[PDB]
Design a binder for this molecule. Structure first.
Ligand SMILES: Nc1ncnc2c1ncn2[C@H]1CC[C@@H](COP(=O)(O)O)O1
Ligand SMILES: [Mg+2]
Ligand SMILES: [Mg+2]
Ligand SMILES: [Zn+2]
Lengths: 79, 49, 1362, 270, 49
DNA sequence: CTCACGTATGCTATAATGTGCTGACGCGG
DNA sequence: TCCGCGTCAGACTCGTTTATAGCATACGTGAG
RNA sequence: GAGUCUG
């Protein structure tokens, strides 16, 4: 969160993986312009990803599943 | 160090024998140094310069 | 480009030509007038490339349009100027030149290859003497040196059919002719026939060299240089200073030397010069090349302009300053700043004051970026000018960027990881950085001008690693020991102490309040003191069996102050935490408790609250320091005059004859040391209480609110030791030698020192200050050796599934339990289902983390010994398992896989040493030691337990001990060990084995000064070999004449007595030898250096008597100065000068041969029929007697144990525990808490390699040293498939060698000895696949650990396919 | 333990024969006729003379050995061009040659930036003059004072004394880390050029089609070669007045595009 | 932040572009080290994947 | 297309022919 | 006897001496 | 490099 990132560590577990997953999500919002699930509330992309992880919306597995979905929709459109 | 003579001694250091080897050093203001020293076998040696 | 590995090998002449883009023929640099490169000179554009981007020299082609267009006229390629940093050239040498690195670098490769001494080769190289290359006529064989005149003789007689030459041509020919294959076979044949012990090593080493030479595909001729490479220009630049002058690299002077002499050699060869002159020029050419490669190795280095030796190629790589340590293992960095630090008490723990102008500059690109997205800046140049003008809208944008962006603060020195922390910055007007108080501990930050580095994490990844891993809030516990580093100090402690501590009645004694709110209202209203005793109603919130909190309300007597502190206290904690008077010791426990019950965010908030309230009440209090606050005891002068007439009486007894310099030194130091304690204890009784306050009626005693006493008792700042020097007696001061001055300082600082006392103080002071400057270096060098050795160690696996572990017992040294088993096995994976006493039901499982709850259960059952899983016994190859390690002490839970454990271990061992160097030294003046280790007095009743003890009964009735290792223990009723007590040799025991003693009984007395030589047998005393002047010395007295004998050692002894061992021999009335009860040994006690015997020969002794007093001068001071070398000796695995002997194999022993006195102890085991026979010195006396069934590693001799011998016989857990305990002894003496698991990491790295016997299916054969992990891998596949089974033996490597033995040469080179490392790697054709951290940091890649472990493991699986 | 290259060489020279007058004449006649041994013996016997000149020529440029070797080159030319028919001794003639070759080498090799003998000879006269001035003027020579004495140009004297300014090793008293790379632009400056170059492409697709076809093909922005007002005629324009009117017309509309986007005077300072 | 020449300019551009992405390269100090070891006559090559 | 300008290699004749700073750290392998 | 090691950043300032023949032909490129 | 410093 804002102050401390302990809760978000408790969701995923490995501090190292927390950082990778929050990074990947922050990159989506930074580049892709992906809409945030929680109200922004004037928060930087680093903190929003940690909010989403804390509440348990964002996760390595979930991100991978939606990557496949958008990627297969694009394959459908190309063919 | 003032020019003159100085008498010093390695307090052990060399040879775990632990022999105190005494030495004289003659220091001039200008010139080569004149050393006298003992060896573990009590032989007096000269080192010029 | 992205590559797998790096390989190093010898450069072929033709290889060197490949890199070259031309031969530089001329020394010409540039033209003095048109400052452009000369023709075929050192900066030739035709060779190295164009001076300006896409422009030829004569200027015919310009602009990016012309690409690779080599101008016909001048001969310059139109490409970027960048090329001149990458393109190399070469030099055609007239004479072959030896490469210094393979010649001079020890051992040397050219010498070892030819089996020819260096001296011989050099005589050949400087053209003093010829060497034979080959003579079919065995007349002259191979490598036989001939002088000038020796060459004339054979030349007439044989000539022609024998080939002998001079200089590097000769050695190159000798190298070309040598057949690596054939010599390998010849050397193998020699080892088969007659393998002499020491020359087997050297032959096996040349065999390994020959084998490795052929496998590398390196050719020995290439050790001699025919072509010489030239470094690209920009890497040896000639640039114009502003002053119009030029400045150039020294490599240019060295290249110009080489070219001038080489070209002059070409000339003198064209001119057919006489050979004396050709020779001189060939010598000078080799001198110039050797200066260019490595200047200073080939003798006197070539001095340039000042007199300083020119910096050569090797010098730019080698030194710490080389390129490794300076530009590659660490660098200067962008988006970095610094300034003075100052307090920010208003800050929360996760914040820091960052000056406006500093932050403006650091976040420049981030501002530019937002400015363009708002469309306030049209482009970058306009954004820059808006910032330069510092416009009002820019501040608002900068405020927006810094929001939730973490910044790294760093303080030198960075001893441990908390020397870098991340904060959220708070923009502040003013030039100073504002630091949060509670983290000042981790930085060792005090605001008397210290500065800090600021660094901006740029990427989203770096921001997240700073916020999650490196944030202040998230790094609360020390990674070294489990404790919180974020701990109140100074003002905060003093304030909370002032609030909690109670006074008699005061305002509003015995009132009643509704909650802490009525209390705060009362205090602030001015109707109640904070120290009033008062009954208040507080509602504590205690955790239940689940996550739900239970609420409990009850009336408890407290002060007003403690009630108000309860308001800060989070729900969950008991009221009993605040109900005591709080000091720093209690507050640290408070925050740890809160962390383990409630969690991180609550403790973070609670910590800030404590800091705010602590400062707030500290200031309300108005506590200060007057001179009357320093109270001198009324009874100082008495204690001192008593002590002073006493020491005077011993000085008068010194001229009389009962005293050596050492004895009286000890006696005077003991008298003053006890006087100092007495005066200090007088001051502290008089000061600590001596508060006469009238309670509600009559007088009472309570604790003093004297300012300095409160400061000391709270632990806010000074200790009792400092206040001794203020108000009591300053004490005995210690000289820079460590030896203590005989005259103590009687006075204190309130009293004021006189000129002599002050001058005498200076010695200790200045030695302290010099110690911080000079000794810090060795501490830091130890940190760096540790780090290099344990860089690779990373958590690789979760559970290796091992049962193996080391039995950890509770350390109970010096009566009072030093370190409890609970804390020692707190946060370590258990192993073997360990239940309760009654073996009928499992209590604890196998793989289970020892939490505070499990540990509390352990204490109710009183478990003494527990096998726990350790790093050393972990089976994981190329790292360690989360379970073997246990809890990340810094996090307070199980370690995360990917964490770089080794680094944390090395840092955490290294830090205290380096900090305690500067710390204890500037802060103390005198040495307040206590040597009174005479009598053991037992604290609690029990029965005496003596393990390992062999004592003889003396005529007094008393048990006089004659064992070396003696451990007196105090057993209770149930039968647990609770107190220990190291009894020495020469001790009188009050009671014997297994006898009852009451509380406060003395059980053993011994003299500390003098270790006596105590005889077992009774009879007459004989002087063997004790010739006066030869071995001893005679010193006579007056009137009657008491002579005393002093045993001069071999140090003062004459050549005549060297071979004689002097010993007091026990004969009987007949003058026959008395035997030692039950053995064949005749009594004889070998007297060491300066053994001062009183009683002259022929004196009837009884048994148990003191023969001889060897003086035991303990000139050691209690500091890390003496301690750290012990630690460094342990980690470096040094054999002591007198190792104690151990039995190699179990089985039954009798004596065989003797060399005069030298024992040849013959072990003849029971099952194992082969004997093991040892030569032993005569004077070294055995603990064991004769036929005993002793196991592997039973102690035979008196002496310290070598870690090598422990490992080799007992094994891993034995040697690991020996190191852990012997190191920890030192750090514990200085009050330093480091967890054993860190030391265990480094010992694992020590036990990395193993020697092998026999062959398997790979290339092992006799005695190759290979890493343990790799031979285990082989053994796993071998045992499944079969093939030749391989016996192994683990080897200990001490730190420096262990780091050089790593199979990465990039780590070995970066560490030390870079020249030697690269020659050995170059000759072996070694390939570094970059597994380690240092390797990846050098190439600037992702670390294989922490964040990088995810990515790195993805690359390793990309090696399996695509 | 004779390890030193110098002491080894001087040992070898001492081991030589010393020549007389009649011996010099006999060997010299055979030497010019082209005797192998005669040339070698005359050279080897006269090495000691080179050492004598080399000994009083140290601490000026090269090392003793360096001068000893270059001096030896003079000895060889001396033996080649010696006249035994002239009664006058060899030692006298050789001394010239040995000093000539040593001096010439010391004038070339010594100086990092290779200084031509012409300038070096001029420099000699300037410095000798400075010495005589210093003896009588208690102070040291000024540039103008030296120029007055030689009747030469002040600028010429200053250029010469500037070339006398020797350069010390940059790595030696480090200086390398103080002195920044002037040719390499900071990422700040390089990023600014990227912004300009990118804006130009967008600015090219914002003006007239014939206003960005002669404005860019002139500066070499889109085209391949940077042409001039007169050279734009090679494409299709084929005009001199109409090219100059249209070049400036493209720039005037673009000046208003920088005044409205918000640069102009903002990007004028820079 | 230090040597990587292309990397530092590219990342500057990204930070003004607001990408906050690294795009790393090869540190120029290491390129020098290689050149300095080859100047010693030791072949030190990068072996590819 | 020719000369000046910048740079380089050349020769000179009493006889002379053999050198020449800074020292002292301390522990280990 | 030799050679290898000996905390980590920061601030500033200074500093870069020597004598070396003159003159004629020869070798080579640039400018008008 | 030789300095005088600040931790
Ligand atoms: N000489 C030193 N070497 C290493 N660290 C130091 C030194 N002096 C100070 N420090 C660090 C350690 C503690 C911190 C505060 O020190 P000060 O107050 O002297 O700065
Ligand atoms: Mg300080
Ligand atoms: Mg301080
Ligand atoms: Zn050109």
């Amino acid at each position: 969160a804002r102050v401390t990132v302990q809760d978000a560590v408790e969701k995923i577990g490995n501090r190292f993986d927390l950082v990778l997953v929050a990074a990947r999500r922050a990159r989506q919002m930074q580049v892709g312009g992906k809409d945030p699930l929680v109200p922004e509330e004037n928060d930087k992309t680093t903190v929003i990803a940690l909010r989403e992880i804390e509440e348990g919306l964002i996760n390595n597995q979930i991100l991978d599943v939606r990557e496949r979905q958008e990627q297969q929709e694009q394959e459908a459109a190309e063919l | 160090r003032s020019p003159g003579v100085f008498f010093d001694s390695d307090k052990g250091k060399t040879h775990s024998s632990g022999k105190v080897l005494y030495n004289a050093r003659i220091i001039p203001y200008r010139g080569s140094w004149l050393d006298f020293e003992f060896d573990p076998k009590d032989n007096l040696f000269v080192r010029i310069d | 480009e992205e590559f797998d590995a790096i390989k190093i090998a010898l450069a072929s002449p033709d290889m060197i030509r490949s890199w070259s883009f031309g031969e530089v023929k001329k020394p010409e640099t540039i033209n003095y007038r048109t400052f452009k490169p000369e023709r075929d000179g050192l900066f030739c554009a035709r060779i190295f490339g164009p001076v300006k981007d896409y422009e030829c020299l004569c200027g015919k082609y310009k602009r990016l349009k012309h690409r690779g267009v080599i101008c016909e006229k001048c001969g310059v390629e139109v490409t970027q100027t960048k090329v001149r940093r990458e393109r190399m050239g070469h030099i055609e040498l007239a004479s072959p030149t030896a490469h210094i690195w393979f010649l001079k670098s020890l051992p040397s490769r050219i010498g070892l290859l030819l089996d020819m001494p260096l001296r011989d080769i050099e005589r050949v190289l400087y053209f003093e003497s010829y060497v034979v290359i080959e003579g079919g006529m065995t007349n002259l064989e191979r490598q036989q040196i001939l002088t000038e005149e020796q060459y004339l003789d054979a030349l007439e007689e044989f000539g022609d059919e024998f080939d002998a030459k001079m200089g590097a041509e000769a050695i190159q020919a000798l190298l070309k002719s040598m057949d690596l294959e054939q010599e390998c076979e010849q050397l193998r044949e020699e080892l088969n026939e007659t393998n002499s012990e020491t020359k087997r090593k050297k032959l096996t080493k040349r065999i390994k060299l020959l084998e490795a030479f052929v496998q590398s595909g390196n050719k020995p001729e290439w050790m001699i240089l025919t072509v010489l490479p030239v470094l690209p220009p920009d890497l040896r630049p000639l640039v114009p200073l502003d002053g119009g002058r030029f400045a150039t690299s020294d490599l240019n002077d060295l290249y110009r030397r080489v070219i001038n002499r080489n070209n002059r050699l070409k000339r003198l060869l064209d001119l057919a010069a006489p050979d004396i002159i050709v020779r001189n020029e060939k010598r000078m050419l080799q001198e110039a090349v050797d200066a260019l490669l490595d200047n200073g190795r080939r003798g006197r280095a070539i001095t340039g302009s000042n007199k300083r030796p020119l910096k050569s190629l090797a010098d730019m790589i080698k030194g710490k300053q080389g390129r490794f340590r300076q530009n590659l293992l660490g660098k200067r960095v962008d988006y970095s700043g610094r300034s003075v630090i100052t307090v920010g008490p208003y800050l929360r723990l996760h914040q820091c004051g960052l000056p406006k102008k500093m932050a403006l500059e650091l976040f420049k690109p981030f501002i530019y970026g937002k400015l363009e997205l708002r469309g306030l800046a049209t482009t970058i140049k306009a954004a820059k000018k808006m910032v330069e003008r510092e416009e009002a809208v820019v501040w608002d944008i900068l405020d927006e960027v810094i929001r939730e962006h973490p910044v790294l603060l760093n303080r030198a020195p960075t001893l441990h990881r908390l020397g870098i922390q991340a904060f959220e910055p708070v923009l502040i007007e003013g030039k100073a950085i504002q630091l949060h108080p509670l983290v000042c501990a981790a930085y060792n930050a005090d605001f008397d001008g210290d500065q800090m580095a600021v660094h901006v994490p740029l990427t989203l990844e770096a921001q997240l690693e700073a916020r999650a891993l490196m944030m202040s809030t998230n790094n609360i516990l020390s990674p070294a020991n489990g404790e919180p580093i974020i701990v109140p100090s100074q003002d905060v402690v003093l304030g909370l102490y002032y609030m909690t501590r109670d006074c008699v009645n005061a305002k509003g004694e015995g009132m009643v309040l509704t909650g802490p709110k009525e209390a705060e209202r009362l205090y602030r209203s001015g109707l109640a003191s904070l120290h009033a005793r008062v009954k208040v109603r507080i509602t504590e919130y205690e955790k239940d069996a689940n996550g739900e909190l239970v609420a409990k309300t009850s009336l408890k007597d407290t002060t007003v102050g403690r009630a108000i502190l309860w308001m800060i206290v989070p729900k969950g904690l008991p009221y009993s935490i605040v109900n005591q008077a709080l000091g720093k010791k209690a507050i640290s426990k408070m925050l740890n408790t809160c962390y383990r019950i409630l969690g991180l965010k609550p403790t973070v908030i609670f910590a800030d609250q404590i800091m705010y309230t602590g400062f707030a009440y500290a200031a309300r209090s108005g506590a200060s320091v007057g001179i009357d606050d320093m109270v001198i005891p009324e009874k100082k002068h008495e204690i001192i005059s008593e002590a002073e007439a006493e020491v005077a009486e011993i000085q008068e007894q010194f001229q009389s004859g009962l005293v050596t310099a050492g004895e009286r030194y000890n006696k005077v130091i003991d008298i003053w040391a006890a006087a100092n304690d007495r005066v200090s204890k007088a001051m502290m009784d008089n000061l600590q209480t001596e508060t006469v306050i009238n309670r509600d009626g009559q007088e009472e005693k309570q604790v003093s609110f004297n300012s300095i006493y409160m400061m000391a008792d709270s632990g806010a700042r000074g200790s009792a030791a400092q206040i001794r020097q203020l108000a009591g007696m300053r004490g005995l001061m210690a000289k820079p030698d460590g030896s203590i001055i005989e005259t103590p300082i009687t006075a204190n600082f309130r009293e004021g020192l006189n000129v002599l006392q002050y001058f005498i103080s200076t010695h200790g002071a200045r030695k302290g200050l010099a110690d911080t400057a000079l000794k810090t270096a060795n501490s830091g060098y130890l940190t760096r050796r540790l780090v290099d050795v344990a860089q690779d160690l990373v958590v690789t696996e979760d559970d290796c599934g091992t049962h193996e572990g080391i039995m950890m017992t509770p350390v109970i040294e010096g009566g009072d339990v030093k370190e409890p088993l609970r804390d020692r096995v707190l946060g370590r994976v258990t192993a073997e289902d360990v239940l309760k006493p009654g073996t009928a039901d499992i209590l604890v499982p196998r793989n289970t983390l020892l939490h505070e709850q499990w540990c509390d259960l352990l204490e109710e059952n009183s478990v003494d010994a527990v096998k726990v899983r350790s790093v050393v016994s972990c089976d994981t190859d190329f790292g360690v398992c989360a379970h073997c390690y246990g809890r990340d002490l810094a996090r307070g839970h199980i370690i995360n896989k990917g964490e770089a454990i080794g680094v944390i271990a090395a840092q955490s061992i290294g830090e205290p040493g380096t900090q305690l160097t500067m710390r204890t030294f500037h802060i103390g003046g005198a040495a307040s030691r206590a040597a009174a280790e005479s009598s053991i007095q037992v604290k609690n009743k029990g029965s005496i337990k003596l393990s390992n003890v062999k004592s003889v009964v003396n005529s007094s009735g008393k048990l006089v001990i004659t064992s070396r290792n003696t451990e007196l223990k105090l057993i209770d009723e149930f039968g647990r060990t609770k107190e220990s007590y190291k009894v020495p040799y020469g001790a009188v025991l009050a009671k014997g084995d297994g006898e009852q003693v009451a509380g406060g009984e003395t059980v053993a007395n011994w003299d500390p000064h003098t270790m006596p030589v105590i005889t077992e047998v009774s009879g007459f005393v004989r002087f063997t070999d004790m010739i006066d002047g030869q071995t001893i010395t005679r010193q006579t007295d007056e009137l009657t004449g008491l002579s005393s004998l002093v045993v001069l050692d071999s140090a003062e002894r004459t050549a005549g007595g060297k071979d004689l061992r002097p010993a007091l021999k026990i004969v009987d009335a007949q003058g026959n030898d008395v035997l030692i009860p039950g053995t064949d040994m005749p009594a004889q006690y070998f007297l060491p250096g300066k053994a001062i015997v009183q009683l002259e020969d022929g004196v009837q002794i009884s048994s148990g008597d003191t023969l001889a007093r060897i003086p035991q001068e303990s000139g050691g001071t209690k500091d890390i100065t003496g301690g750290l070398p012990r630690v460094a000796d342990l980690f470096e695995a040094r054999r002591p000068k007198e190792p104690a002997i151990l039995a190699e194999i179990s089985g039954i022993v009798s004596f065989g041969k003797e060399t005069k006195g030298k024992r040849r102890l013959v072990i003849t085991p029971v099952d194992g029929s082969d004997p093991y026979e040892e030569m032993i010195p005569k004077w070294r006396q055995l603990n064991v007697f004769e036929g005993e069934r002793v196991e592997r590693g039973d102690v035979i001799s008196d002496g310290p144990e070598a870690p090598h011998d422990i490992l080799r016989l007992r094994g891993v857990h034995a040697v690991t525990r020996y190191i852990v305990n012997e190191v920890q002894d030192v750090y514990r003496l200085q009050g330093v808490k480091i967890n054993d698991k860190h030391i265990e990491v480094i010992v694992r790295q020590m036990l990395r390699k193993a020697t092998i016997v026999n062959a398997g299916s790979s290339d092992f054969l006799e005695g190759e040293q290979v890493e343990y992990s790799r031979v285990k891998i082989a053994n796993r596949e071998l045992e499944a498939n079969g093939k030749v089974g391989a016996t192994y033996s683990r080897d200990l490597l001490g730190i420096t060698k262990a780091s050089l033995a790593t199979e990465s040469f990039i780590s070995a080179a970066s560490f030390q000895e870079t020249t030697r490392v690269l020659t050995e790697a170059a000759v072996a054709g070694k390939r570094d696949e970059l597994r380690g951290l240092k390797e990846n940091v050098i190439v600037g890649r992702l670390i294989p650990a922490g964040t990088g472990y995810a990515y790195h493991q993805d690359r390793m699986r990309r090696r399996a396919a695509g | 333990r004779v390890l030193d290259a110098t002491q080894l060489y001087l040992g070898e020279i001492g081991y030589s024969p010393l020549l007389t007058a009649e011996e010099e004449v006999y060997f010299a006649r055979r030497a010019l006729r082209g005797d192998v041994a005669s040339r070698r013996r005359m050279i080897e016997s006269n090495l000691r003379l080179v050492v004598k000149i080399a000994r009083r020529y140290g601490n000026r440029g090269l090392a003793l050995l360096d001068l000893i070797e270059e001096g030896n080159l003079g000895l060889i030319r001396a033996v080649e061009k010696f006249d035994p028919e002239r009664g006058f001794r060899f030692s006298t003639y050789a001394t010239w040659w040995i000093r000539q070759t040593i001096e010439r080498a010391i004038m070339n090799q010594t100086r990092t930036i290779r200084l031509p003998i012409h300038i070096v000879k001029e420099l000699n006269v300037y410095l000798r003059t400075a010495r005589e001035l210093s003896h009588k003027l208690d102070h040291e020579p000024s540039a103008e004072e030296i120029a007055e004495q030689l009747d030469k140009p002040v600028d010429d004297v200053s250029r010469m004394l500037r070339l006398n300014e020797r350069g010390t090793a940059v790595d030696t008293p480090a200086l390398l880390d103080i002195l920044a790379d002037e040719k390499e632009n900071g990422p700040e400056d390089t990023t600014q050029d990227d912004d300009m170059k990118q804006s130009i492409v967008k600015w090219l697709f914002e003006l007239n089609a014939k206003q960005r076809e002669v404005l860019a093909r002139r500066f070499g922005l889109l085209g391949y070669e940077a042409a001039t007002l007169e050279d734009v005629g090679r494409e299709i324009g084929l005009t001199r007045e109409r090219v100059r009117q249209i070049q400036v017309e493209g720039l005037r509309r673009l000046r208003e595009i920088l005044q409205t986007q918000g640069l102009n005077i903002e990007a004028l300072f820079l | 932040k230090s040597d990587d020449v292309n990397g530092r300019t590219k990342m500057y551009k990204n930070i003004v572009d607001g990408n906050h992405q690294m795009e790393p390269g090869m540190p120029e100090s290491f390129n020098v080290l290689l050149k300095e070891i080859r100047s010693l006559g030791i072949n030190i090559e990068l072996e590819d994947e």
